[PDB]
Amino acid sequence: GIFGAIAGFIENGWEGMIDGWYGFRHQNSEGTGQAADLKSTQAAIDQINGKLNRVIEKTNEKFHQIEKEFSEVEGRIQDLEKYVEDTKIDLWSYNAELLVALENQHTIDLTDSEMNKLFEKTRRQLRENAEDMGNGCFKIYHKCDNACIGSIRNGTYDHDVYRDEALNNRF
Amino acid sequence: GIFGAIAGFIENGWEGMIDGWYGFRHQNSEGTGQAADLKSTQAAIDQINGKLNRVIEKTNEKFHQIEKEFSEVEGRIQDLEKYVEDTKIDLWSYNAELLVALENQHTIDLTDSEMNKLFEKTRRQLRENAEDMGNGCFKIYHKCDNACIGSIRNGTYDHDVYRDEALNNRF
Amino acid sequence: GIFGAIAGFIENGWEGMIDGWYGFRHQNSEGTGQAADLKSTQAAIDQINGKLNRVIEKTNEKFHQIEKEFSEVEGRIQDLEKYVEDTKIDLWSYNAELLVALENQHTIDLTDSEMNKLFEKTRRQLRENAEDMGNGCFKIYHKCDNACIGSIRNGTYDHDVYRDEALNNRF
Amino acid sequence: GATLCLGHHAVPNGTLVKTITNDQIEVTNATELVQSSSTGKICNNPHRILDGINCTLIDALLGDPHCDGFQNEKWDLFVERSKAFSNCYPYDVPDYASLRSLVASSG
Amino acid sequence: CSSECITPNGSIPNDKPFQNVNKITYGACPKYVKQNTLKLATGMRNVPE
Numbered sequence: 001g002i003f004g005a006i007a008g009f010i011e012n013g014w015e016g017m018i019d020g021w022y023g024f025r026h027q028n029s030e031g032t033g034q035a036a037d038l039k040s041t042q043a044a045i046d047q048i049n050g051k052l053n054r055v056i057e058k059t060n061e062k063f064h065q066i067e068k069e070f071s072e073v074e075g076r077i078q079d080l081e082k083y084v085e086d087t088k089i090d091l092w093s094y095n096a097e098l099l100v101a102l103e104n105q106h107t108i109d110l111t112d113s114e115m116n117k118l119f120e121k122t123r124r125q126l127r128e129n130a131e132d133m134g135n136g137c138f139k140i141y142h143k144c145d146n147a148c149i150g151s152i153r154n155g156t157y158d159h160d161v162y163r164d165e166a167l168n169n170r171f
Numbered sequence: 172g173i174f175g176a177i178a179g180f181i182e183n184g185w186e187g188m189i190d191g192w193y194g195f196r197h198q199n200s201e202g203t204g205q206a207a208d209l210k211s212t213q214a215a216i217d218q219i220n221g222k223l224n225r226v227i228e229k230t231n232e233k234f235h236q237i238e239k240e241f242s243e244v245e246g247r248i249q250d251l252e253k254y255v256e257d258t259k260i261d262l263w264s265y266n267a268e269l270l271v272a273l274e275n276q277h278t279i280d281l282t283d284s285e286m287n288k289l290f291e292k293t294r295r296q297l298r299e300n301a302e303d304m305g306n307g308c309f310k311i312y313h314k315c316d317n318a319c320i321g322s323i324r325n326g327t328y329d330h331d332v333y334r335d336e337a338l339n340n341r342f
Numbered sequence: 343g344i345f346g347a348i349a350g351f352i353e354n355g356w357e358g359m360i361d362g363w364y365g366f367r368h369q370n371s372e373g374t375g376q377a378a379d380l381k382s383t384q385a386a387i388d389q390i391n392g393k394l395n396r397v398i399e400k401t402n403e404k405f406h407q408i409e410k411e412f413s414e415v416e417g418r419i420q421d422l423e424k425y426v427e428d429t430k431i432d433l434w435s436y437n438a439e440l441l442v443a444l445e446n447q448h449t450i451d452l453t454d455s456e457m458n459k460l461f462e463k464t465r466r467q468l469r470e471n472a473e474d475m476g477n478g479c480f481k482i483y484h485k486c487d488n489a490c491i492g493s494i495r496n497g498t499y500d501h502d503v504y505r506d507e508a509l510n511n512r513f
Numbered sequence: 514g515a516t517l518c519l520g521h522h523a524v525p526n527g528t529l530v531k532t533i534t535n536d537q538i539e540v541t542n543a544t545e546l547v548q549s550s551s552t553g554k555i556c557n558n559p560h561r562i563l564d565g566i567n568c569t570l571i572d573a574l575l576g577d578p579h580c581d582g583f584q585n586e587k588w589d590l591f592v593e594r595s596k597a598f599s600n601c602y603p604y605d606v607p608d609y610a611s612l613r614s615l616v617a618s619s620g
Numbered sequence: 621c622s623s624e625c626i627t628p629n630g631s632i633p634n635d636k637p638f639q640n641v642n643k644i645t646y647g648a649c650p651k652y653v654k655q656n657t658l659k660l661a662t663g664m665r666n667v668p669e
């Protein structure tokens with residue numbers, strides 16, 4: 001999208017991730033793992049819903065209106081009634097087409113945004129202990145077991161602990 | 172917002188900053204300080220005004236129009252006059268609601284943008300002499316007095332000067 | 343724009359670049375060079391066209407409508423015909439003004455986005471072997487001849503090759 | 514060391530939608546904003562529906578004998594059928610449309 | 621049965637913002653438009669592999 005993460009520097013999506021919209025796959029000494037990130041998944045879902053509720057909202061109630069069909073040719077007044085209805089329909093048809101186009105463009109961009117925000121958050125956590133591999137994966141230059149990975153995921157990772165090790169392995 | 176700076180990785184705003192929209196707080200050997208960034212404050216205000224002036228602009232002048240209230244039941248023509256007016260009001264009511272929603276979304280996003288741009292500008296200035304702490308604060312690994320901080324703020328900071336010192340302290 | 347690249351941290355555009363929208367200028371041992379990036383140029387052009395085709399698309403066909411001019415003063419019905427047409431014209435005039443404003447704002451933002459995306463892609467390629475000079479230029483800390491620059495441009499650059507050299511020269 | 518990958522999900526069956534820059538582009542899910550179908554029946558709740566059957570509203574108004582069932586009736590929505598017909602003295606209403614309207618509206 | 625929106629074709633559900641069924645309606649009704657479909661995206665760009 002506009003941030004270049006989804007269909008971006010992130011090659012493709014994971015059909016295998018069924019418990020969330022965004023998440024982590026990791027590989028460390030202990031094996032491989034996958035976990036969903038629920039906060040950012042929620043951010044996206046919440047926004048999309050907000051918008052869904054804006055649009056799907058109560059319609060307008062109308063009761064007696066002008067006649068829209070005619071069995072006789074009347075000339076002027078019917079010309080006018082017909083023209084008014086036709087005008088209205090064209091204008092609303094336009095509003096709807098555009099609403100959808102804008103809304104969709106924005107949804108695409110905001111979901112891309114959430115992805116990119118998770119990436120950024122994580123990179124910032126890792127400090128000097130990892131490098132950006134450009135594919136949306138970090139290379140972690142110290143020894144990271146499942147607990148450690150977890151600490152990255154739940155935001156409690158303490159970089160100063162591994163900094164020496166990692167710094168050593170980076171250079 | 173869409174860049175994740177405001178209400179983002181930046182925890183919250185400063186009620187104490189009354190001289191600008193965006194700024195720096197610093198802590199160094201000499202003490203603590205706060206200063207507003209006027210260029211980016213202006214960037215935001217200018218955009219918001221541009222938009223404010225687009226919307227608040229001259230209204231349309233109309234003089235003799237159709238009658239919108241009626242004391243007698245007339246049937247067809249009155250049905251039509253009523254329907255036309257009602258149609259118009261619904262359409263404009265829609266335009267207004269939407270204008271506000273879009274405009275507001277965009278204002279939120281563009282103010283977020285300005286913040287993030289200031290952050291990015293600064294990070295780029297500092298080069299290898301500082302690290303991103305993730306909270307919207309940089310850690311500066313050399314000795315920075317009030318003049319030096321100032322140089323960062325007014326964009327004249329020369330990193331090569333402190334690079335050796337900082338590089339030393341970083342690793 | 344919203345990413346702060348164009349009219350951003352990138353000082354200005356190159357009137358000298360006539361073969362693409364975005365590109366690289368380099369200076370190395372062998373001399374100076376300039377090359378266009380066709381993929382991102384295409385990304386921009388494609389989007390702009392998509393939009394151009396959305397708007398420039400087939401118009402609506404209308405045939406017999408109400409009369410919009412009058413040689414005699416008739417009162418009520420003419421008041422109504424006149425009012426309907428005037429209402430329609432004001433609403434479409436609004437749609438058009440807004441379409442243009444939004445679309446343009448977005449074009450500006452998306453072209454800025456493409457630039458920034460190219461920058462980001464490149465920075466990611468270079469890994470530890472270069473630094474962001476903040477002007478939209480990277481400083482490459484190893485010896486890069488025209489072939490090497492090319493490899494950066496066509497996305498085949500292998501950083502691990504030069505990492506030792508560059509790491510050495512950076513610190 | 515370890516590798517940590519950031520990712521987003523994807524699905525087997527995606528949906529084409531339309532955007533500002535793009536005519537068809539595939540997203541994971543979409544929802545339909547235009548109702549194109551009908552059950553086919555006029556639902557008798559929550560509106561008082563008066564089925565006119567062989568009677569038009571005007572004939573019901575005037576009192577054409579085969580319409581006499583409609584005397585003093587009320588409706589939120591009067592439904593006129595195509596099979597309706599007039600069995601009484603042949604007549605006409607100048608500005609038929611307006612009488613029909615204002616009575617229909619009085620309800 | 622029950623429904624808030626009546627058209628000459630029959631009743632229609634009012635849950636959506638728009639409808640292609642009939643320009644003639646009674647009650648609380650989706651606005652009428654010329655399109656038979658408009659999809660509003662409810663998720664991100666799908667990128668399989």
Ligand SMILES: *[C@@H]1O[C@H](CO)[C@@H](O[C@@H]2O[C@H](CO)[C@@H](O[C@@H]3O[C@H](CO)[C@@H](O)[C@H](O)[C@@H]3O)[C@H](O)[C@H]2NC(C)=O)[C@H](O)[C@H]1NC(C)=O
Pocket residue numbers: 549550551628629640641642
């Ligand atoms: C709901 O009701 C309306 C009105 O009964 C339906 O519209 C009608 O649909 C048919 C079939 O698409 C149209 O037939 C076409 O007529 C045109 C014009 O004469 C002719 O050139 C074509 O060859 C075609 O036969 C018909 O015009 C149209 N009637 C009106 C007045 O619009 C509609 O299909 C119904 N929708 C649902 C959900 O049932």
Ligand SMILES: *[C@@H]1O[C@H](CO)[C@@H](O[C@@H]2O[C@H](CO)[C@@H](O)[C@H](O)[C@H]2NC(C)=O)[C@H](O)[C@H]1NC(C)=O
Pocket residue numbers: 566567
């Ligand atoms: C509506 O009018 C139709 C047609 O006049 C009526 O159908 C008639 O019904 C009677 C009694 O069942 C039959 O003997 C006739 O053969 C029918 N006539 C025709 C021409 O089909 C119908 O009864 C009327 N419906 C109501 C409820 O009044």
Ligand SMILES: *[C@@H]1O[C@H](CO)[C@@H](O)[C@H](O)[C@H]1NC(C)=O
Pocket residue numbers: 147150151154155156
């Ligand atoms: C994060 O993970 C660690 C280790 O698994 C755990 O001890 C800690 O409670 C977690 N933090 C939170 C706030 O969930």
Ligand SMILES: *[C@@H]1O[C@H](CO)[C@@H](O)[C@H](O)[C@H]1NC(C)=O
Pocket residue numbers: 318321322325326327
């Ligand atoms: C920035 O700060 C330095 C030191 O305080 C000062 O000498 C210099 O003039 C300032 N630069 C500008 C352009 O204001």
Ligand SMILES: *[C@@H]1O[C@H](CO)[C@@H](O)[C@H](O)[C@H]1NC(C)=O
Pocket residue numbers: 489492493496497498
């Ligand atoms: C990129 O450049 C190198 C060296 O000039 C060349 O050998 C290689 O084929 C190029 N790669 C592609 C995919 O064009």
Ligand SMILES: *[C@@H]1O[C@H](CO)[C@@H](O)[C@H](O)[C@H]1NC(C)=O
Pocket residue numbers: 052542543544662
């Ligand atoms: C698709 O979106 C709709 C509306 O948001 C939702 O009700 C439905 O559960 C979604 N389908 C899937 C499989 O996510």
